[PDB]
Design a protein around this ligand. Structure first.
Ligand SMILES: C[C@H](C[C@H](N)C(=O)[O-])C(=O)O
Ligand SMILES: C[C@H](C[C@H](N)C(=O)[O-])C(=O)O
Ligand SMILES: C[C@H](C[C@H](N)C(=O)[O-])C(=O)O
Ligand SMILES: C[C@H](C[C@H](N)C(=O)[O-])C(=O)O
Lengths: 251, 251, 251, 251
């Protein structure tokens, strides 16, 4: 009955360093929606744990050359963690190498941009090359465009790909600052856009959702914990706890 | 220089009868998001108008037999109205018979149901036959399921169709009541679900968005007003007026 | 420049018949806080007037069956009076049919009862059915309970409603005597409770204020006099005249 | 059979240092409404006690960061006192961490200001930014505004918060002086306003009560003294002793 190693990633308001005038220890060092979720999972299912930040700082994507995965997905594959509790998108390509619990939140890719412009959709971005746009490198949004067969999205990936180092960023925070400082549109997940626009009155979502997906807890393929976590999540959902947590962290 | 005839439909909070102690006349008899939109359109483009409620009380669907359309769509086809300003979904099948302005709002089909249940997605509904589910008859949501080739949605339509008279309702309002008084789940548009859940704390959206679409102003095919209205809408969007209108009527 | 018809209602110490060994005429026939107020309004704004007692002897409520109003509210609606100067509560439902000046006095609903009992709140009354309680029929207090969604108040209305003819009275004076003669608690406005308890040492207020409201001068909707009266009232308030009038009539 | 430690706070006329030429000892060093109440409680329930002044000088509020409470509330939580007998407001947020006896007095938040001004309500204050307004830091009134969802009160808090160090004071006394020496309106409890206006003829309450609440004796959660104290208070209330105590200290 050893403590489980839970990998996650810094992402407001799901996971962040808790601030305090005095020293913090162990799990108390972190806070956020996913941290509250993890706590609930541990008491419902009866396990102890330790929080680890994904070492390469990535969510997870497959390398073009060697086909190897990185990020949290890879840490689960290599059994460097028992669980991945973070805003981790459940995707078909990931389901091939790791397992996911049922979703604890639903969302979709959308566009973050400055308000007061004539850009009103992805098509408005794809039809021009002046305004640059991108996404978080090695994340689910990037992979969506990289694998899309939809004309507009295919051309958008061709654009991003050709300017990979200039338009792909290392985090949502970096993408947001890019939007606030230059003529740049950012492809990010709707749930995070909701949080951002609520705090940056000069920003807004552009258009609707480009796709639909959900966040789930990740486990190494075959892990006996996956089905147990799904039971816990469904219980939290039904009792309205997940709704309560969303309200608390989004305000 | 005659006034334009604008067809619409009662649907809170887009269009409703304005309440007052003193007799109301003309366009002042109605109010709502779409009524405010119509007003802005008239002063920006320079036209006067009169509001008409779609005679058959339907949004618009194609008949299986004669293949003819009904509702607002049909009123436009037969030139019984110059414009249709309402929460009218822009869809491929409709675009074949009428024209649409660019969208003034984005949304997607989703599920409305009571809180505290184990139903967490459409799949949860489709895999069972105990709790019934449906949509508004002759609307875009019903048509979506009727034309879908996605397994889950395909069997969901088989279900609805076989119990058409018992599960398909005449309005969102009827559906909401059906949900509050019986084991029934309702397929409706996210923007309306948003309005409903904020006023019915026992209800909640189930899962995420099943599709993505937008509302646009409808015009008879070939109408010279379509492109002009698109220009007006984009201006209202860019200046933040559409966002202001949404906040005013949803709150 | 005809004299205005001012409707009011007998209610100590706002309005009462002035006593005198010799015959009294015109406006000299009445006295009280509201009569002093009316006089001030007439000289500040420059108008003459005649005092009329509301014919049906009611303050004003909407009928359940036909939705018609009665009391002073109805006399204003039917233009049977230019102004209503009395302890008339400014309420949302009334604002729909008549206009009110800014408040000239603030108050709240409370409970009048005998002292020396274990009843200490509305909850103490609502949890039992032995001690009866009520309010003035067709007044603002009755309407407050009739429209309240607050559990305790909802159950209290269910009680009063089921015993309407036995517990609802025609006036505060009738309610007070009911309290002095039988095991009965009376829901009345705090300002009047203040006057009563000061003269009936055996009575007392129970609990705090159940709501907050104010008294205002009523006028038919759209009356040009409403804003003028507000100016007069605010001036009287600022100079301390309203405070002086309260002290004079409450002692 | 040890004496109980009772925490309280200096606040006229509930608690103050008794003045005398000869040295005073023990409980005789204090006096006031709450000191008389405490005395009656001790003889009715059969306990001895010692009075302690809350060390941090605060009533009690929850910290935004660590979420910890301070003031008398915190002294009770940490069992640094057996009882808190003072004008301690019974509130929902406090009831989550400590217990309260039934109320021994009812009141509501209101506005204290100079007479002869055009300010007649909270709205009059909230619609302007010239004259400043505030409340006692870390008290129930401040918390009310900080948690309110009522538009007017919401913007009033935005105002106070943005000028926290300049408008939030350490005591009612500081607030009263702030009102007598500058263009400042003070949000304080009605029962205290009542005491102040009777001794400061230039001051007056503005508008009516903004909310309704009561003062109760606080105890650590689960304390066996809570229900016993409620019984004592209800007895004092029924016999008219609480009314007598109010008259004695307010006059
Ligand atoms: C940053 C985010 C990561 C995304 N939640 C994932 O799981 O890879 C994105 O791709 O937009
Ligand atoms: C009621 C609604 C109608 C839909 N807005 C339309 O344009 O047909 C629906 O189909 O869900
Ligand atoms: C008697 C009184 C009337 C109340 N002042 C009104 O305006 O209807 C009450 O309802 O308590
Ligand atoms: C000073 C007073 C404290 C208040 N009686 C309390 O219990 O926190 C206030 O908040 O207005």
């Amino acid at each position: 009955n050893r403590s489980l190693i839970v990998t996650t990633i810094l992402e407001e308001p799901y996971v962040l360093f808790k601030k305090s005038d005095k020293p913090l220890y162990g799990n108390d060092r972190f806070e956020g929606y996913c941290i509250d979720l993890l706590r609930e999972l541990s008491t419902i299912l009866g396990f102890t744990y330790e929080i680890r930040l994904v070492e390469d700082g990535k969510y997870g994507a497959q390398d073009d050359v060697n086909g190897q995965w990185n990020g949290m997905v890879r840490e689960l594959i290599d059994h460097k963690a028992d669980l991945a509790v973070a805003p981790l998108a459940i995707t078909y390509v990931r389901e091939k190498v790791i397992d996911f619990s049922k979703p604890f939140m639903t969302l979709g890719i959308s566009i973050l941009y400055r308000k007061g412009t004539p850009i009103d959709s992805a098509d408005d971005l794809a039809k021009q090359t002046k305004i640059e746009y991108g996404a978080v490198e090695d994340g689910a949004t990037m992979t969506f465009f990289k694998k899309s067969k939809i004309s507009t999205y295919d051309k958008m990936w061709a654009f991003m790909s050709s300017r990979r180092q200039s338009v792909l960023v290392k985090s949502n925070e970096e993408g947001i600052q890019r939007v606030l400082t230059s003529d740049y549109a950012f492809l990010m997940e709707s749930t995070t856009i909701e949080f951002v626009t609520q705090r940056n009155c000069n920003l807004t979502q552009i258009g609707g959702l480009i796709d639909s997906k959900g966040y789930g807890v990740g486990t190494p393929m075959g892990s006996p914990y996956r089905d147990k976590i799904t039971i816990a999540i469904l219980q939290l959902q039904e009792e309205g706890k997940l709704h309560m947590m969303k309200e608390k962290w989004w305000r």
